[PDB]
Amino acid sequence: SGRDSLIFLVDASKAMFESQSEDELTPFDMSIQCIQSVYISKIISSDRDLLAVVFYGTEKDKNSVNFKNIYVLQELDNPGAKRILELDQFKGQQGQKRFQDMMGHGSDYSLSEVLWVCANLFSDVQFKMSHKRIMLFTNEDNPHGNDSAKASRARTKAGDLRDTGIFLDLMHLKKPGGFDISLFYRDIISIAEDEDLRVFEESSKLEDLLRKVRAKETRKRALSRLKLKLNKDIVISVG
Amino acid sequence: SGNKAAVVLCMDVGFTMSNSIPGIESPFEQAKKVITMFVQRQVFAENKDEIALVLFGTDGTDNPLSGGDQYQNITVHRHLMLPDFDLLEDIESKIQPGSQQADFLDALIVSMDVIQHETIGKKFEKRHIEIFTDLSSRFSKSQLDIIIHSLKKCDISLQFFLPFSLGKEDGSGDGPFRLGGHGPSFPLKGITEQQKEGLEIVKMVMISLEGEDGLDEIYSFSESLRKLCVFKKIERHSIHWPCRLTIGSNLSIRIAAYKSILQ
DNA sequence: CGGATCGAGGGCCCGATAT
DNA sequence: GGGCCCTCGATCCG
DNA sequence: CGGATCGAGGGCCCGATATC
DNA sequence: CGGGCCCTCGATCCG
DNA sequence: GGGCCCTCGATCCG
């Protein structure tokens, strides 16, 4: 048995605050509401999952090793009423204003450093982490397309995370002209070792984001492991 | 239309580099003099080449690999970019000797990470690392096999610079010492069993990369100052032009000649 | 109420070309 | 600059 | 005591050159 | 847009 | 009295 660790990484770039000329919430608004919904569901269900909320691309930086433009809003800890109340301050069009006022936005970031802080966040947990998972909410299909060094360093640190046992799942948000995995996110995200590649589409509605997030939310938990005996000699094992 | 190359100078700044032998300038000042000579040529001739500077054994840690408690006494003073006057001023006086000691192979790995990440796209034609150390610091042989593999796969050449010169293979390698002079340019007995062990590892690595003649790429700071070996790996082909050697009639050897010697 | 046709788009070779 | 090719638009009949 | 000479300037052809 | 060439000046000494 | 329903408590596996 063990407690699962889940870290929510949210992009705070200029593109995230644009409601792509539609009635849908801005990708940032979609993310904040999705995170809140997960927190409440985690409280309702009886599951020892530890959650965290980290932002990148903000002017104000608050983190363990003082990396520029990385704000760790919530450390890895159990979900609480006070935590959901803190996220509610960013929910909505009025909440976006509250976010821009508390911390900046659209600042130059470095994805390599972002994953370093996140990995360092799992480092500081004492109880056995059964599953380590990072969910990146972003609408930038090719970040650091201009900066070659930041892009390669990020690819390297993503590899270091996968070799550690940390799962990297993409929550790509509405982007003008579609979201391309081939530009970025194709190799960084952790794919199933037994292929199963190219599995999800870009999220446009909150209901869709919530359904993808909650699908990879909790690791399959088998109620029982039994023997399926076809015949006295032919016996397969099923969960 | 020109020969570009990514050069990373990996300088040992450990306390032991500040340890000085009577009459002889401390290996820290010696390495500093060699680095300044190199950067000066690249700066004033205005050659299009980017230079990075990594220092190992510094008191602090500013390195991308510092995560994990690893490489905590290696500082990337200059990232891969075209050298400028600010860099020369920093080398001349801003950079001061540190109190810690680092693993020279660990520093080599930091330099390799700089080349691997800042060289993306065929922007640079040649890749080169120049290590400046005394080998007095202890080190670990753990990833040497990987270091050699990554150097080959990335096509990066190496060059070592020590306070002492390679003793003659058999016999021969102590009075006055003059930096840059011919002959007595290193204490014959100053080598420490720790330096000897480091040297044997240096030898093996150079041979593994460039074969038997790789050992010729290990210089002493003194001799390095009175040679152009520091540019050897970034040295530009002499400009050649084609012609025909015409013997008579009907015989015409197609040739291509270049200026062997030119002031 | 489709064909046939005709502008005006698009992308590779090649003598003058500042380099 | 020359040949090439494709895609629409404008012109008429079934 | 002006020539002779040699460093370090200046000006014309010619393969790569973005150009129709 | 460069590379080799060659000449013209300018500064230094000897006849 | 009979069916219904909900809330704990005691029993075992992951």
Cα distance from A124 to chain B (closest Cα, Å)? 12
Domain count, chain B: 1
Buried-exposed string B151-181: b where 16+ CB fall within 10 A, e elsewhere: beeeebbbbbbbbbbbeeeeeeeeeebebee
**Which positions on chain G have an atom < 7 Å from some protein CB?**
13-14
* Four-point Cα dihedral A93, A99, A104, A106, nearest 10: -40
- A164 — contact with chain B (CB < 8 Å)? no
Q: Please state at what angle helix A92-102 crosses helix A27-44, rounded to 10 degrees.
A: 100
A67 and A117 Cβ atoms separated by less than 8 Å:
yes
Q: What is the DSSP letter of B237?
A: P
Look at strands B126-132 and B156-162 and give their pairing. Answer: parallel
Q: Is residue B190 part of a domain?
A: yes
Distance CA A26, CA A16 (A): 7
Distance CA B200, CA B251 (A): 55
Distance CA A138, CA A115 (A): 14
Please check whether strand G approaches the CB of A224 to within 7 Å: yes
Residue B197 domain boundaries: 5-234
Q: Is residue B257 part of a domain?
A: no
Nearest CA in chain A to B63: A113
Distance CA B172, CA A76 (A): 65
Task: Report the half-sphere exposure of A134 (CA within 13 A, side-chain side).
Answer: 27
A129 and A4 Cβ atoms separated by less than 8 Å:
yes
From the list B110, B89, B95, the residue with the least C-alpha distance to B43 is B89
Q: Is residue B248 part of a domain?
A: no
A17 and A86 Cβ atoms separated by less than 8 Å:
no
Q: Is residue B245 part of a domain?
A: no
Distance CA A203, CA B156 (A): 44
Q: Is residue B187 part of a domain?
A: yes
Q: What is the resolution of this structure in A?
A: 3.0
Question: Measured between alpha carbons, how far is residue B166 from residues B203, B213, B250 in Å?
Answer: 10, 13, 54
Give me the amino acid identity at A24.
E
Which chain B residues have a beta carbon less than 8 Å from that of A119? 67
Distance of CA A70 to the CA centre of its chain: 15
| Maximum C-alpha span of chain B | 75
Distance CA B46, CA B60 (A): 32
Buried-exposed string B122-141: b where 16+ CB fall within 10 A, e elsewhere: eebebbbbbbbbbbbbebee
Backbone φ and ψ of B195, nearest 5°: -70, -40
Q: End-to-end distance of chain B based on CA atoms, in angstroms?
A: 23
A58 and A103 Cβ atoms separated by less than 8 Å:
yes
Q: Is residue B240 part of a domain?
A: no
From the list B164, B135, B158, the residue with the least C-alpha distance to B224 is B164
Distance CA A213, CA A233 (A): 42
Q: Is residue B221 part of a domain?
A: yes
Residue A129 domain boundaries: 2-217
Q: Which residues contact A196 (CB under 8 A, 6 or more apart)?
A: none
CATH of the domain at B92: 3.40.50.410
Q: Best mutation site among B80, B109, B117 for testing chain A: the one with the most A CBs within 10 Å?
A: B117
Obtained via which technique? X-ray
From the list B90, B7, B92, B91, the residue with the least C-alpha distance to B48 is B7
